[PDB]
């Protein structure tokens, strides 16, 4: 349809709550070629957000249920297949992503800001398939999201300054990728409290439309930090 | 208190 | 498949809040043509509840959009036909659970608590038709939830005590099909008024097993009473 | 607060 039809439609599906049709709706904007706006950026990354984060938030519970019913032999086994079903809508969902990621998204992205964006949904859908995976094709999930985090953290750190939201939600997903996925509790610190002070050190860098963003981010660095000193 | 939020 | 295999996978669906498979696997144990125990006939109201209450809550999100772009012409047909899509997919879920109960829940129905049950469902599921009906069309609709209400109204009445949750829980539906459909803030009133002072009058008949599920109905029986009286 | 929830 018109792109703008599209738009004001996901913009009514996120009020609805309806976030497969919001999904749907900034998929076919997508799929136009055209760079997004930071609004319909936005309006895409919060759609499969919340389309992803249903899927993982069912997956913790099962399994969750799945290892509580261990010495339940018939109740186990239907945690499994369900579990099982919601990683399979889960990986799809993903592949999806970054299959948008890759076609149109991080290729036609002009500008640094658009392209840290996106190498941090990357990273972030590839961290979302790692939370399933196992073995070695793990191993390959995990090495392709630090490898978005990274790019997108070197690009952040030449071009943005250090107060600027998306390097501070940046540097938020990539150091949870440390603690995580790598079980690493102190190189997600020591990145996180980088971030922190870095962003206290030059706060005269920060904007009056973005400062209630980077402070949020900041306060949720410092949960990471007093959750992770613990 | 995790990753970013919308 | 086997309907203890369906029912144990609803109860995860639920723990997992993945409503649509909930309903899906309710659905198939009542389309089986045995009769639902009490533990498979909530979980068929808890999942349809679920599954409808999402279309009526964005349909009210979506309706009340549309009245505050009265004067945005582009903004206002583009939340009229939302609240028409979603309106679509609320009738759907409607007919299918009135084709449930019609068809395999209310026939069957052995027990005089099972069918106060499945009578005040076709009144609440007609109501929610009602609340997006509009003319003759709504008109008949309003008519069969009143039938509905009234049939299990009478039935619980001479049936069950004052004190039965599902009775109470009737006549907490009943007097809001009377404010809210019929617009009589006080054929409501008396009937939660009559339910809660009769409950109070026999408070000796309530049960051990049920009477934290009938003290909370007497509580929202008294909250719309309050709020009506404003 | 209005009818009757899960």
Redesign the interface.
């Known amino acids: 349809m018109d792109k703008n039809?599209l738009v004001?439609?996901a913009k009514?599906?996120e009020?609805?709550?309806?976030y497969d049709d919001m999904a749907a709706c900034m998929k076919s904007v997508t799929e136009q070629g055209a760079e997004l706006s930071n609004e319909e950026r936005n309006l895409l990354?919060?759609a499969y957000?919340?389309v992803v984060g249903?899927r993982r938030?069912?997956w913790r519970?099962?399994s969750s249920?799945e290892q509580k019913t261990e010495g339940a032999e018939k109740?186990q086994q239907?945690?499994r297949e369900?579990r099982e079903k919601?990683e399979t809508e889960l990986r799809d969902i993903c592949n999806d992503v970054l299959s948008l990621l890759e076609k149109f998204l991080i290729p036609n992205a002009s500008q640094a800001e658009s392209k840290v964006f996106y190498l941090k949904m990357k990273g972030?859908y590839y961290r979302y398939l790692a939370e399933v995976a196992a073995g070695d094709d793990k191993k390959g999930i995990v090495d392709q999201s630090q490898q978005a985090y990274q790019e997108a953290f070197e690009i952040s750190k030449k071009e943005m300054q250090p107060t600027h939201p998306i390097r501070l939600?940046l540097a938020?997903?990539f150091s949870?990728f440390y603690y995580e996925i790598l079980n690493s509790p102190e190189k997600a610190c020591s990145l996180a409290k980088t971030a922190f002070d870095e962003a206290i050190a030059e706060l005269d860098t920060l904007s009056e439309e973005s400062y209630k963003d980077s402070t949020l981010?900041m306060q949720?660095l410092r949960?990471?930090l007093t959750?992770w000193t613990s | 208190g995790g990753s970013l939020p919308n």
């Open positions: 039809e004001q439609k009514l599906a009020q609805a709550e309806r990354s919060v957000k919340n249903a938030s069912s519970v099962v249920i109740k239907m945690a369900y919601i972030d939600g938020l997903n949870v981010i949720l949960d990471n959750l």
